[PDB]
A = this chain, B = another copy of it.
Amino acid sequence: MYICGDSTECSNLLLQYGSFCTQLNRALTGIAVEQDKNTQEVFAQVKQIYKTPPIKDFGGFNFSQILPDPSKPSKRSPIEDLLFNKVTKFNGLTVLPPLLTDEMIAQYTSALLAGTITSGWTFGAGPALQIPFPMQMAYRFNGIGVTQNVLYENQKLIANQFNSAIGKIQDSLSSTPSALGKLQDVVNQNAQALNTLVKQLSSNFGAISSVLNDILSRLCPPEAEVQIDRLITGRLQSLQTYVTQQLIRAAEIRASANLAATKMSECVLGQSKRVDFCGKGYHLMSFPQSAPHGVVFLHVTYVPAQEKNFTTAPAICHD
């Protein structure tokens, strides 16, 4: 349809070329399959779907903006609704559906979130083991070199700072339109490629006309095939160019997906010590949120404050 447009004479000439259609279809299929693979590696990190308790008794820590909202027709968190609302044919070019729908992504995301809130990282290694949320935090504090005294003595302080930070994120994402530029850019690049490919159909490529039907209605075979044969290589060149660019671009997306999957395992289903890997500051924990064509992580970190100057020494001399 792209090259000949159901012209019989063009098809017969297209058959004189190599198995280019086969190669183009294999390349695009390979990309299409990979895209579902990427989605599964990033989100299907948990073998069970964990449910939350009624949302109560988390020690003052409020997860309402990141947990699914039961009143909605689509069970997404308030933050996910904001993320979704921020990201914005007959020539043989079609679009295939994803294997995992937004609803299935939402279920994996809520499973991981329910899992980390009620069992910490244990669900990622073996069975989920329930733990009071504040005790989970105590361990996360030990994990950054801070004793447990700090968490319990300041539990109210910590819960309030946490709750404040989540609220700020929801407002920040709503306010700034560039906040999700990384996902919008992917969409825009792919749209441009398709909206460039369909325009090459208007090109003559040295032929008397861009349209096969005009060549055939006005010229006789000894000349008509010559003109068709220019358009036919013109259109094939455009398709090969398109496919090559999609393969390169797909590789970049795969690299991003591999990183996203790594982060979910190390930032969401554990506590990482890799510097500035799971957000700036000392990592405590993180929570995933879904977004069109991607994943958004909320990284919770500990940042030291209000330092004071003290005199020091490597050792004390006693007796």
Contact = CB atoms under 8 A, between A and B. Distances in A.
Interface of A: 13, 16-19, 22-23, 27, 45, 121-122, 124-127, 129-130, 132, 134-135, 138, 148, 152, 196, 199-200, 203-206, 229, 234, 237-238, 240-241, 244-245, 247-248, 251-252, 255, 262, 265-266, 269-270, 272-277, 280-282, 303-305, 307, 309, 312, 314-315
Given A200-B18, A205-B16, A312-B135, A125 B280 contact: yes
Given A206-B13, A277-B265, A304-B126, A18 B234 contact: yes
Given A251-B248, A275-B121, A303-B126, A206 B234 contact: no
Task: List the 3 closest A-B pairs by CB distance, nearest first.
Answer: A270-B275, A18-B200, A126-B304
B276 A265 contact: yes
Contacts of A241: 23, 240
18 contacts: A18-B234, A18-B238, A22-B196, A23-B241, A121-B275, A124-B275, A125-B275, A127-B305, A129-B307, A134-B314, A206-B229, A248-B251, A265-B275, A265-B276, A265-B277, A266-B277, A272-B274, A273-B273
Nearest to A229: B206
A205 B17 contact: yes
Which of A244, A281, A303 has the most B CB atoms < 10 Å from its CB? Answer: A244
